[PDB]
Amino acid sequence: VKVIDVGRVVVKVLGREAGRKAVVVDIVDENYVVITGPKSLSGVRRRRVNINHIEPTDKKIEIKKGASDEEVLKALEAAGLVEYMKERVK
Amino acid sequence: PKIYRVVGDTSTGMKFVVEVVGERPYDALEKVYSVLGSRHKLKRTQIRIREVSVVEPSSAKSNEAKMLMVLEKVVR
Amino acid sequence: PKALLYVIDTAKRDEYPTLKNFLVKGGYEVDVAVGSRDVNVNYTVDLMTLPSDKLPTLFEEYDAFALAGGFKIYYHVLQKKPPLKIWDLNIDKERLAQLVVEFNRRRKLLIAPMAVPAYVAQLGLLSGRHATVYPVTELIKILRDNKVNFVNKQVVRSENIITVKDITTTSEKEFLAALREKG
Amino acid sequence: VKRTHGYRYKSRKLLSKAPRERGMSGLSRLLYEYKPGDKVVIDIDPTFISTAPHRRYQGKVGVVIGTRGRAYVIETYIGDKKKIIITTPEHLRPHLGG
Amino acid sequence: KTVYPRYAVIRLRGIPTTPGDIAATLDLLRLRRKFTMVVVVGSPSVMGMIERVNDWVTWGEIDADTLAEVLRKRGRIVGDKPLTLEYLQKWGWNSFEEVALAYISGEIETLACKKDFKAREGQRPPCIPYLKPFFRLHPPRGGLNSVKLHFSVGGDLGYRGPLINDLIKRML
Amino acid sequence: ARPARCYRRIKGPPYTREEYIHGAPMIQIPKFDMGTTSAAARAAFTMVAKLVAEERGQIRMQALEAARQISSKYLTKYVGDANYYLRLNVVPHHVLRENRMLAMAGADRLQEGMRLAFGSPAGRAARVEPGQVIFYVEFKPEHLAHVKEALRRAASKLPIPTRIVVEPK
RNA sequence: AGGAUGCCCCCUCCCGAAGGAAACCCCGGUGACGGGGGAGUACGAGGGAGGGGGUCCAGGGUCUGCCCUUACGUCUAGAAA
RNA sequence: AGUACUGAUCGGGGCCCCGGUCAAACUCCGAACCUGCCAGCGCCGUAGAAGGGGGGAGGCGGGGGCGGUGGGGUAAGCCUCCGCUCCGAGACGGGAACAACCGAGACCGGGGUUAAGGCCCCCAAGUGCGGGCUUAGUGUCAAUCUAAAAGGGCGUCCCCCGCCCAAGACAGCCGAGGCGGGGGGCCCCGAAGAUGUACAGGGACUAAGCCCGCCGCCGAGACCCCGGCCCGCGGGCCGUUGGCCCG
Ligand SMILES: [Mg+2]
Ligand SMILES: [Mg+2]
Ligand SMILES: [Mg+2]
Ligand SMILES: [Mg+2]
Ligand SMILES: [Mg+2]
Ligand SMILES: [Mg+2]
Ligand SMILES: [Mg+2]
Ligand SMILES: [Mg+2]
Ligand SMILES: [Mg+2]
Ligand SMILES: [Mg+2]
Ligand SMILES: [Mg+2]
Ligand SMILES: [Mg+2]
Ligand SMILES: [Mg+2]
Ligand SMILES: [Mg+2]
Ligand SMILES: [Mg+2]
Ligand SMILES: [Mg+2]
Ligand SMILES: [Mg+2]
C-alpha cells in the first residue's frame, strides 16, 4: 500500500515536473497533498498534488504542517539530502 | 487547508449547506460540483452557489472536516 | 522590480501563462492575485478577502500592475450579455477600478491587454494618449469615444500605460521592447 | 367526407362579431372617395354580406382601377393570378402603408 | 452614420438534410459550402438572417488582424487566383492590414466590391475590386467540440463572441 | 370493461359535448363532497392534505368511485364524519369510446374491424394534468396519520402515480 | 507485335502546394496536456539534375497474405431474398 | 386563458352571491406563427428577370424520419390529412449487420485536415485526468434493436425539516449525542418460454459500469492542395453540314 506523510520525500510521476523530487508539507484531504521542491532546489513549485501522481521514497525529514520553504530547506540540511533532491529519476 | 462553508440550492428545489476542506475556494467548489453531481444527478448549471466562507475548525459542524484538518498521513 | 498580475479570467486559455512569462523574461518578479472563486490558478494575494486598509501596503510594494482580463472585461466594456454565464464579471468592480486608478496615479506601470485598454479608456485614463486595443469594431469605437488615439501596432506604450492587442499574438521581443522603453 | 364549397363555406369565425361591434357599423367608410391608383384593403363587413367579396380576399391589398356606378373596380392577386374584385366601399379601407 | 459591428460567419454543418428555410438563408448569406466563411456588417436585417441559421453556423466579432491574415492566405480574386499585396497596391491599398482595418473600423462598408461596381481612375475604391465575396477555409486543426451542440453548452454552433478569431486561426 | 391501460393516455381531443353525443353514459358517482361540508364547521379544521397527480392521463369514472369509497369509508371509521371534509375534486367530463361489434347500437356497429371505426360510448373519465388535485381533505392536526392512510388507500385505486401533499389552510 | 535512351537500388543536389513535428529552455495546470522559443525549420504530393551498382521491365497464368465486397434480368415504396 | 354568450358540473350561503370542475361541433381576451402591400437589405438577372409560343415526355401505386395530444383506433411495421427533409433516382464514414437514424453529398489519381463516432483486444486512436456512486457481472457511450410498471427496501450514498439532550437525552447507575418525518442518486425484489453459454457485436471487464466535469488523439469520396479529364456559358481564329484556341 502507498503511504504519504508530512515530511516524506516523494517523486512526481506525472506532469512537466516528472522525475523530480519534492517534500510533502501538508495534507489537503484523503486525495491531495501539498508538495514543495523546494523550487530553488529541485524545480518543483509549491502546489497541491494528487496522491496518484507521486511516489514515496525511503527518505523522510521532520517538519511541521504547512512548513515554509525555508524551514523545509533547513531540514533538508540537518538530514543531508540536498544533493538527493537535485537528482532526477528516469 | 481550510474548511469552506458552502451554501447553495438547486433548480430541483433542494437546499444544502455543506463543509468542504480545500486549499482554495476553487478546489472546494470543484468538490461540491462533482459530489453533488454524482450523488443527485445534478448538472453544474442546476447548482447555484450562494455563499462560500471559511469556518474555523473549532466551530465547524462536520467531524469529517475536523478530522481532515489534523491529518498527518494518507494511505492509498 | 515586482509586478502584480490580477487574473480576473481564464477563458482566454493562454493569456495568463503567456503574460507571466513575458514579465518574468522582462526581469520582474510576479505575484498573482485573484478576485473570484472561478479562477483555477494558484495565487498568493486574495483580493476577495484582502481588507481595504491593506490596499496602501499593496501600492507601495509593487512596481507594475498587469490585468489578465479575458472575455469578462470584454463583455463588461461593451455592456453586452456574454454567450456563457461564466464570462460574467463576478469580481468586485469598485475595488478593480480603485486598483487601476491608484496604480496609475502613482505613475506605476500598467499592462492592459486585449479589451483591458478599453476598460482603462472608459475610466478616462488615456484621454489624448496613444493606445491600441483588440481591433474589433466596437472596441475601437469605445477608444475613439473616450478621446483616445487608436494605433494599429501590436504593443503601444503611452508613458506608463502599456496596451497590447492580444498577448497571445504578441512576440516576446515586441513586449520587451515596450517594457524597456521610456515613459 | 369531402369539403363542401358554398360561397361562404368556412366563414363562421370570419363573419362573427364581438358583442361590442354588434349592430350597424359607422358610415365613414362610405365617404372615402377612391381614385385610380389608390391602394385599398379588403375588410369584409359582415352586416352587408351579400355585397362582400369572397373570404379568400380578406386582408388583401388591391389597387383601384376605376368605378362602376357605386362600386370600385379593384385589381388584386390570389397567389400569382390577377383577380378583379368589384365591391362597395363598406367592404374597403384605405391602405396608408403604400 | 451608424457603424454596425463586423461579424465573421462560418458554415459548420453540411448540405444534405439541412431544413429548407435554413438552406435558403445560408445560400443568400453566400455560405453555400461547408467551412465557407463570410464577413458581414451586423445591421438588423443581417442579424435576423444569422438568427435563422444559428443552428448551422458559428459567428462572432472578427478582429482586424485576423481579417488581415484571412485575406493574405484565403483571399481569392476573379479566376480563383490568390490575392497578393501587389494587386492591392495597384488599386491604392498599401497593405492587407490597412484594408482590413478600414473595413473593421467602418471606414468602408464592404470588403469585396459589388458586381456592378465600376472602378474609377486614381480614386481608391471603397472596397477590393473583384475579390470573391467568400472565403474557403481549411478544417480546424485539432477539431471542434461538437457540430450538433450550441457553443453555449459546450458545442460549436451559434454565437461565439471574440473566440471566432481563435477558431479562424485554426482554420487558415 | 377493458383494462384501464386502454384509456389511460390522452390520445385525442376532449369528448364532452353531450348534445352531440348519442347515448353518453350517466355519471355513476353519487356524491363528491363527504364528511362535514358546511362552511361554518370546516373552520374548526386547520390542516389540508391533497392527493396530487404526478402525470397527465385519464382516470376512469369507476376508479374515481373506487378511490372515493375506500378513503371515505376509512375516514368515517377512524376519524369520524364530524371531524373531516373530503372532496373529490375532478369530474369525469370526458366520454370514452369503444369499437366493438354489437347489436341494438346502430347499423354501422355491425360492420367488423376498422370499417366505420368511430366507437360507441363506453364510459367516462377525467382528464388530469400533472400537479392537479384529485382529492382534497380538511382535517384537524391530531388525525394526520389517519388522513395519510386514507389517501394512500385512494391512490392504490388510481391509474396514475400520485403524491400526498400536507399543508396548513 | 511494347520499352530496353528501360526498370530497380543506393547516394548526392535543386525546387516544392496544402500541411508540418521532435530533443531541449521558459510560463501555466493535480493531471491528461496548453502556450513562448526551437520553427513555417526537419519534413512534405510531386517536379528537375547528376553518380555508382545490378538485370531484363511492362504484360500474362496461377497461388498466398492483408484490405474491400449481399448472382444476374424483372414488377415493385422496398431484391442477396 | 376563461367559464362572461351557448352548454356541462361539484359545493357553500341568502332566483341571487361566493368558491370549484369542464367544452372538437362555447368565446370577453389572446400569443408564437403564417400571410397582403410598400420601402430597404440579401441574392439571382442583359452570358437574359417577368411574361409568351412551340415539340417530346415520364408520371397520374409512392415510401422513411421528425413535428401538428394532428383525426380515428385497445394498439399496430394500422387507416386518413398537413409541413421540412431524405430514399425511390444518391456513392461514401458511423450505427454489428440494415433504402430513407447520425455525418456527408462521390469526374480520375495522389498528399493533407476534419465530421459523425470512437480510442483494453478483436479495430486506427487513451488500460487518458480529477471527484463521487454501484456489488447486482446491475451494467457495458442515441434511434431502427431485443424491454419493463404499479408497488416494496435507511441495501447503500446523500440533502432538508420537526422534536429531545444544556451532559439529569436514546438502550438496558452509566456519559454523548439521540428519535421521528420529507425528498434525491445507484442498486435489490416485483422480473416466467420454448435449437446453443452472465445475448444485444464477441472476448471479457469491478471498471473496460454509472453520475459531474476535463485533456489529447484516431477517423470519410466531406473541407484544403497538386496533377489529369470533362462540361456550361461567353469571346476569338480558320472557306466551315466542321475544326481549333482563350476566359
Ligand atoms: Mg377537392
Ligand atoms: Mg339575395
Ligand atoms: Mg443530417
Ligand atoms: Mg390521437
Ligand atoms: Mg521494340
Ligand atoms: Mg413483385
Ligand atoms: Mg408489394
Ligand atoms: Mg435484383
Ligand atoms: Mg381550464
Ligand atoms: Mg395556418
Ligand atoms: Mg393514388
Ligand atoms: Mg410522409
Ligand atoms: Mg418505381
Ligand atoms: Mg454500417
Ligand atoms: Mg490499435
Ligand atoms: Mg406502462
Ligand atoms: Mg445483464
Cα–Cα dist F82/C128, whole Å = 87
B31 touches strand H (CB under 7 A): yes
DSSP classification of residue E6: E
Longest dimension (CA), chain B: 39
Q: Are F134 and F53 in contact (CB under 8 A)?
A: yes
Q: Do E5 and C166 touch (CB under 8 A)?
A: no
Q: What is the dihedral of CA F77, F81, F86, F91, to 10 degrees?
A: 90
Please report, for residues C47, D50, D83, D87, the alpha-carbon distance to residue D90 in angstroms, rounded to integers and kept in the order given.
Answer: 75, 12, 19, 8
Residue to test with chain C: of E61, E69, E111, E169, most C Cβ within 10 A: E61
CB-hemisphere CA count at 13 Å for C150? 21
The DSSP bridge partners found for residue D63 are: D39, D75
> For chain F, where are the alpha helices, taking DSSP H only?
39-42, 61-78, 144-155
Please report, for residues C63, C103, C147, the alpha-carbon distance to residue C107 in angstroms, rounded to integers and kept in the order given.
Answer: 9, 7, 20
Nearest CA to A11 among A52, A68, A40? A52
Within 10 angstroms of residue B10's Cβ, the number of other Cβ atoms is 15
Cα–Cα dist A20/C82, whole Å = 42
Positions of chain H reached by protein Cβ under 7 A: 7-13, 20-29, 35-45, 51, 69-76, 78-79, 84-87, 102-105, 112-117, 129-133, 150-151, 157-160, 182-186, 210-214, 216-219, 222-225, 247
The sign one gets for the Cα dihedral E18, E20, E24, E29 is: negative
Within 10 angstroms of residue C36's Cβ, the number of other Cβ atoms is 20
Q: Do B72 and A2 touch (CB under 8 A)?
A: no
Cα–Cα dist F64/F62, whole Å = 5
Query: Under DSSP, is residue E59 helix (H, G, I), strand (E, B) or coil?
Result: strand
Answer whether B65 touches C (CB < 8 Å).
Answer: no
Q: Copy the grid coordinates of residue D1.
A: 367526407
- C44 CA from centroid of ligand 5 (Å): 86
For this entry, resolution in Å reads: 2.0
- E16 CA from centroid of ligand 14 (Å): 19
C-alpha angle with apex F164: F161 to F168, nearest 5 degrees? 155
F91 touches strand H (CB under 7 A): yes
Q: Copy the grid coordinates of residue F6.
A: 386502454
Q: Which residues of E touch C152 (CB under 8 A)?
A: 64, 97, 101
Please report, for residues A26, A31, B55, C176, E53, the alpha-carbon distance to residue B60 in angstroms, rounded to integers and kept in the order given.
Answer: 20, 21, 6, 50, 53
- Write down the residue that cell numbers 475590386 correspond to: E129
Cα–Cα dist C150/C141, whole Å = 9
Element (H, E) at B68: helix B63-69
Residues 47-106 of C with CB under 8 A from B: 48, 85
Q: Are C46 and C37 in contact (CB under 8 A)?
A: no
Cα–Cα dist E107/C150, whole Å = 14
Method: cryo-EM
Residues sharing a CB contact under 8 Å with residue B1, sequence separation 6 or more, in sequence order: A26, A27, A28, A29, A34, A66, B21, B22, B23, B68, B69
Nearest CA to D14 among D51, D41, D52? D52
DSSP classification of residue F118: P
Cα–Cα dist B32/B5, whole Å = 11
Burial of D88 (0-12, 13-18, 19+ CB in 10 A): middle
Strand nucleotide closest to residue F116 (CA to C1'): H72
E43 touches strand H (CB under 7 A): yes
Answer whether C165 touches E (CB < 8 Å).
Answer: yes
Angle between helices F144-155 and F61-78 (to 10 degrees): 160
Query: Under DSSP, is residue C90 helix (H, G, I), strand (E, B) or coil?
Result: coil
Element (H, E) at C93: helix C93-105
DSSP E strand stretches across chain D: 39-42, 61-68, 71-78, 81-87, 92-94
Cα–Cα dist E102/B27, whole Å = 46
Which chains border F (3 or more CB–CB pairs < 8 Å)?
Answer: none
Cα–Cα dist C6/C73, whole Å = 12
**Count of CB contacts below 8 A, B vs C?**
13
Residue C86's closest chain B neighbor by CA?
Answer: B45
Cα–Cα dist E45/C10, whole Å = 34
Query: Under DSSP, is residue C42 helix (H, G, I), strand (E, B) or coil?
Result: coil
DSSP classification of residue F97: E
- B and D make contact (3+ CB pairs below 8 Å): no
Within 10 angstroms of residue C105's Cβ, the number of other Cβ atoms is 10
Answer whether B52 touches C (CB < 8 Å).
Answer: yes
Report, in this order, helix, strand and coil percent for chain C, each rounded to 5.
40, 20, 40
Nearest CA to E62 among E166, E157, E140? E166
Please report, for residues A74, F1, F2, F55, F99, the alpha-carbon distance to residue F5 in angstroms, rounded to integers and kept in the order given.
Answer: 79, 11, 8, 14, 16
DSSP classification of residue F7: G
Q: Which residues of A touch B62 (CB under 8 A)?
A: none
Q: Copy the grid coordinates of residue A4.
A: 504519504
Q: For E4-41, give one letter per residue: b (16+ CB within 10 A) or e.
A: bbbbbbbbbbeeeebeeebeebbeebbbeebbbbbbbb
Cα–Cα dist E56/E35, whole Å = 11
DSSP E strand stretches across chain A: 3-5, 8-12, 21-27, 32-36, 47-50, 54-60
Angle between helices E64-74 and E96-105 (to 10 degrees): 130
Q: Are F151 and F68 in contact (CB under 8 A)?
A: no
Answer whether A28 touches B (CB < 8 Å).
Answer: yes
**Hits for CB < 7 Å against strand H across D residues 5-44:** 16, 18-20, 39, 41
Q: Which residues of C touch E3 (CB under 8 A)?
A: 137, 141
**Hits for CB < 7 Å against strand H across F residues 40-59:** 40
Query: Under DSSP, is residue D16 helix (H, G, I), strand (E, B) or coil?
Result: coil
Tell me the shortest Cα–Cα distance from B61 to chain C, in angstroms: 23
